[PDB]
Amino acid sequence: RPDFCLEPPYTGPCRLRIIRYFYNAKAGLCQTFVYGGCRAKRNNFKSAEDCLRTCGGA
Amino acid sequence: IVGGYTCGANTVPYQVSLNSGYHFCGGSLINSQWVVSAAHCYKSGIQVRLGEDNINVVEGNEQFISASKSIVHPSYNSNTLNNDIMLIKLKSAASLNSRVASISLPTSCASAGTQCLISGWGNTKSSGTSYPDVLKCLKAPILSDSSCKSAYPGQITSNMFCAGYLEGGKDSCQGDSGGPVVCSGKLQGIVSWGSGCAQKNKPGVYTKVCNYVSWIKQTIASN
């Protein structure tokens, strides 16, 4: 999996509250987190499916 | 809103909630069919919720009206966050006054030190996570452009201003974006961004509405 998948979820500086998915490398599972709306990092997905397809593989 | 307090029942009638399945941004009603919010709050299929302090109640005193048009400022920059403002037209007119009234646009910009009212249904914890069921309010003064730029070197444009306390403890937070910053009965700011929430030397940054009055009026008149 890409190295960015190992980075912790990044909420960012903006202040909206929208649910996004991130790959939790420690749990080996894609989970949800609160994204702030701007300056998203790559470990930020709009669905568990996309998160898994991108970060699931070893 | 962190370090704030439960707003008085219907004390913030111009406050609205932008919904996309659930509350994600705040907004300010400027007339019967137009709402002002942050540009980063743009999403397709937005529905506006008005007139209800409690964000979860359905069939209470609230009104759900679909957005028919969502116009983001044409120069919004998602990297610098410059020009972070958006206009939303409601599909139908909302019932005004009682628990739903518009907020007047400024005729002139406010000054540092001016006390303002910030509100929203955002996070109430600076470190943890606790979203409220009722609308929260906060009294915060506008900070000098000088201390704003010192707090965020190279990040503050002429279309932004800081409000809050450098000591931390009081500030807007995730879930408050797009919300109003009212100073002396005038909409001078829009919740935009900040480094974390309620952190020392990291005050909230807000869109400077007084700089877009002309854009707002002309946009509303042409659409």
UniProtKB/Swiss-Prot annotation, chain A:
GO cellular component: extracellular space; serine protease inhibitor complex
Compartments in which it is found: Secreted
GO process terms (BP): negative regulation of platelet aggregation; negative regulation of serine-type endopeptidase activity; negative regulation of thrombin-activated receptor signaling pathway; trypsinogen activation
Record keywords: Disulfide bond, Pharmaceutical, Protease inhibitor, Secreted, Serine protease inhibitor, Signal
Record site feature (Reactive bond for trypsin), residues: 15-16
Coiled-coil ranges from the UniProt annotation: none
Keyword Amino-acid biosynthesis: no
Gene Ontology MF annotations: calcium ion binding; molecular function inhibitor activity; potassium channel inhibitor activity; protease binding; serine-type endopeptidase inhibitor activity; sulfate binding; zymogen binding
Disulphide linkage map: 5-55, 14-38, 30-51
BPTI/Kunitz inhibitor domain location: 5-55
Described purpose of this protein according to its UniProt entry: Inhibits trypsin, kallikrein, chymotrypsin, and plasmin.
The protein, known as: Pancreatic trypsin inhibitor
Organism field: Bos taurus
Swiss-Prot record, chain B:
CDD domains on file: Tryp_SPc (cd00190)
GO cellular component: extracellular space; serine protease inhibitor complex
UniProt activity-regulation remark: Is inhibited by scorpion cyclotide trypsin inhibitor TopI1.
Keyword Repeat: no
Subcellular location: Secreted, Extracellular space
GO biological process, one term: proteolysis
Keyword NADP: no
GO molecular function, one term: serine-type endopeptidase activity
Tissue expression per record: Synthesized in the acinar cells of the pancreas.
UniProt EC number: 3.4.21.4
Active-site feature positions: 40 (charge relay system), 84 (charge relay system), 177 (charge relay system)
Keyword tags: Calcium, Digestion, Disulfide bond, Hydrolase, Metal-binding, Protease, Secreted, Serine protease, Signal, Zymogen
Cofactors (names): Ca(2+)
Disulfide bonds: 7-137, 25-41, 109-210, 116-183, 148-162, 173-197
Reactions catalysed, as given in the entry: Preferential cleavage: Arg-|-Xaa, Lys-|-Xaa
Main location: secreted
Gene3D superfamilies: Trypsin-like serine proteases
Post-translational modification: Subsequent cleavage after Lys-125 leads to alpha-trypsin. Further cleavage after Lys-170 yields pseudotrypsin. A cleavage may also occur after Arg-99.
Family designation: Belongs to the peptidase S1 family.
Subunit structure: Interacts with SERPINA1.
UniProt-recorded name of the protein: Serine protease 1
Organism: Bos taurus (Bovine)
Classification of source organism: Eukaryota, Metazoa, Chordata, Craniata, Vertebrata
